[PDB]
């Protein structure tokens, strides 16, 4: 299996700090995306760690996940500043037209939804950003152009 070669040299370079577990579980998602259902108890039995403790770590933090991620991830902000300018209805328009709920992805083409709050463009309307093409002032009717160029 080719999977058991990319996870080997990462437990030797960024694993010399005494007590590091969070960093290793983050670079795996960074370099592959999907946190595998099989690698977890392998990295557990490897160094010193029971599988139960790192399973508990993996499901607590919202950044980690155990379900397929699409190529393109869309975030709807939803901080307390970008909530007063009608940012509740834009996610409703998203789920009305595309189909998937928040936190559930359509694995077919490329799409995934996520709810990270209050990005650094705070002060420029509710900021619904695509992976690298953050927008500004948005309207429930503007959604269509997001489906136009990104499709």
């Amino acid at each position: 299996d080719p999977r058991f070669e990319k996870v080997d040299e990462i437990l030797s370079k960024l694993a010399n700090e005494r007590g590091a577990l969070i960093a290793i579980l983050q670079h795996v998602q960074h370099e592959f995306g999907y946190l595998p259902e099989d690698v977890i108890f392998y990295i557990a039995s490897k160094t010193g760690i029971p599988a139960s403790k790192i399973y508990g770590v993996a499901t607590f933090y919202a950044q980690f996940h155990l379900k397929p991620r699409g190529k393109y991830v869309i975030r709807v902000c939803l901080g307390t500043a970008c909530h007063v300018k009608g940012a509740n209805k834009i996610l409703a328009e998203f789920e009305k037209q595309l189909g998937i709920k928040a936190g559930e992805t359509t694995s077919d083409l490329k799409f995934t939804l996520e709810r990270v709050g209050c990005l650094g463009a705070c002060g420029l309307a509710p900021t619904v950003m695509v992976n690298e093409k953050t927008y500004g002032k948005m309207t429930p009717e503007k959604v269509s152009e997001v489906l136009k160029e990104y499709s």
Binding site: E37, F41, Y42, Y55, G56, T59
Partner: protein, 571 residues
């Protein structure tokens, strides 16, 4: 020693510095409720139901509050009672209320605290916990009644060092789980049963098989033999309102006779069988001087812990079967031909206090010698089911010819009592004489220490012996052995802390000092017997001279031996 002066509820208190404000108020004739606290665990503070009010006017938890000079506290103020009532309403708002179906009925602590705090109308009605029940083997997990106290995780973390289960998810939807919701058989569990003993709700229980026993009894052509464990005789009476440690052998024999069982036997006969076989093995290993140290096989959980974690010690383990399986083989091999019954038509039931026996009964390699197993709680529930009054029964003895026993096989429910039952036999077989007077008892292997060590001198020959109770102490002693500091000869390991008297099948108790009472009961039972030596039993010798003619023979190697295979799957 430095004492601290304070007042609690208007009463002066003298207590040593360092005790909490809950554990130092128990000796005033007052007790404050709590669910997240146990006497064997570090305080955790997840219940938030043991709160009290100090002088300032803010509610402070008690199970993790050290006491200092100059506080006034009150545990009956209306604000504290209102807070406790609201907290229990919040708990019971999300609990599936099938108290008829709950196995922990009439013993659940949540039920008793809901009765005590006078809850009558739940105002907070909303979304409940709706999970799905899965099967795991001898452990029945229902994550609909969990209150997330964390006792099971801490007892599998702080004491056992097994790390089998851990928390998962967050918020209202958090629960206790193995990795990826795999069954407990394939996880790192070793089936010790400690998590079952400490659960204050009905989340963790036993997969109960009274039904199969009932169609076994109802079949007119099936003959039923039931065997009883040594550690059951000292703990059953607690189920009927007696003081723990009362000898109830005759009463439970009468109850088993009236329950419809065809024959009743004790497993002390097979225990003496194991003692004499293990003594022969130890003498053989001393004469060759190979494969040291050698480990006992009396605990299935220890065998699982070796097969899962330490597969390199497999050649160093004794190949003798557990006494339960040896009694099953004897009943289905020798007794059946004596009575004149077919092997398929004999039903063997066991009453043992352990939980790993439930898993061990269904191994494919044992050829299904025993068909079903029980624990003490199910035996008590059957006794109360048939209507038998336990107080006013009459004492009656065991059956024949596997009923009588010796004093060497009555101390298996104590940490150290197995090797203490084998040193007398080794002394007899190697020296040629028998111990007399107080030299029968070995005082160096009694107590409750984590690791017990002794250097026993027999006819000028010294042997080094060790006892480890609890898997944590076993891991420590295995580390010491692999360090090569000192060499041993014969090592006993019991998975549960304190021996088989603290197994998962024993009845629930709230007294903090039950272990001392159970040890005293076991020792009083041992000292109240005429014969104290395993070698002096008669029917053991009769069985050898009629069917085997020699211990450690080819027939004994065929029937009283098994082999172990590694379970550590490569990743």
């Amino acid at each position: 020693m430095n004492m601290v002066m304070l007042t609690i509820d208007g009463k002066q208190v003298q207590v040593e510095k360092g005790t909490t404000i809950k554990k130092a108020a128990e000796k005033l004739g007052i007790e404050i409720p709590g669910l997240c606290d146990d006497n064997d665990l570090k305080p955790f503070g997840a219940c938030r139901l043991c709160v009290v009010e100090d002088a300032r006017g803010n509610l402070v938890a008690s199970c993790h509050t050290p006491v200092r000079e100059g506080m006034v506290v009150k545990t009956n103020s209306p604000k504290v009672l209102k807070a406790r009532r609201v907290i229990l309403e919040l708990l019971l708002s999300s609990h599936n209320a099938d108290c008829f179906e709950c196995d922990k009925n009439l013993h659940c602590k949540l039920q008793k605290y809901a009765y005590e705090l006078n809850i009558r109308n739940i105002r907070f009605k909303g979304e409940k916990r709706n999970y799905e029940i899965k099967d795991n083997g001898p452990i029945y997990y229902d994550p609909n009644k969990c209150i997330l106290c964390g006792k099971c995780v801490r007892i599998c973390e702080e004491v056992q060092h097994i790390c089998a289960i851990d928390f998962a998810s967050r918020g209202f939807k958090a629960y206790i789980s193995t990795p990826f919701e795999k069954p407990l058989l394939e996880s790192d569990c070793i089936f010790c049963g400690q998590c079952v003993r400490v659960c204050p709700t009905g989340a963790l229980a036993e997969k109960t098989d009274i039904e199969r026993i009932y169609e076994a009894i109802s079949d007119p052509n099936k003959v039923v033999v039931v065997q009883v464990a040594p550690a059951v005789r000292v703990a059953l009476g607690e189920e009927f309102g007696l003081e723990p440690g009362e000898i109830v052998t005759g009463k439970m024999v009468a109850a088993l006779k009236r329950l419809g069982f065809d024959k009743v036997f004790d497993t002390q006969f097979a225990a003496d069988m194991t003692i004499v076989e293990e003594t022969a093995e130890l003498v053989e290993r001393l004469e060759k001087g190979e494969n040291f140290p050698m480990f006992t096989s009396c605990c299935p959980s220890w065998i699982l812990a070796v097969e899962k974690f330490y597969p390199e010690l497999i050649p160093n383990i004794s190949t003798a079967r557990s006494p339960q399986q040896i009694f099953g083989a004897i009943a289905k091999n020798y007794y059946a031909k004596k009575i004149g019954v077919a092997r398929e038509n004999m039903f063997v039931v066991s009453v043992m206090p352990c939980i790993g026996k439930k898993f061990e009964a269904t191994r494919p390699e044992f050829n299904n010698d025993v068909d079903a197993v029980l624990t003490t709680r199910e035996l008590a529930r059957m006794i109360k089911e048939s209507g038998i009054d336990f107080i006013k029964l009459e004492e009656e003895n065991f059956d024949s010819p596997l009923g009588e026993s010796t004093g060497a096989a009555a101390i298996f429910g104590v940490t150290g009592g197995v090797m203490e039952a084998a040193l007398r036999t080794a002394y007899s077989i190697m020296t040629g004489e028998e111990l007399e007077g107080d030299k029968i008892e070995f005082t160096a292997v009694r107590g409750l220490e984590g690791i017990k060590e002794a250097e026993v001198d027999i006819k000028g020959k010294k042997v080094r012996i060790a006892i480890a109770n609890g898997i944590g102490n076993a891991k420590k002693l295995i580390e010491k052995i692999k360090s090569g500091e000192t060499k041993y000869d014969f090592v006993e390991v019991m998975a549960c802390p304190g021996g088989c008297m603290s197994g998962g099948g024993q009845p629930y108790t709230d007294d903090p000092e039950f272990r001392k009472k159970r040890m005293e009961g076991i020792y009083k039972n041992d000292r109240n017997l005429p014969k104290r030596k395993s070698h002096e039993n008669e029917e053991v010798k009769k069985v050898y001279e009629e069917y085997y003619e020699k211990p450690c023979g080819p027939k004994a190697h065929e029937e009283l031996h098994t082999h172990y295979h590694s379970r550590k799957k490569e990743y």
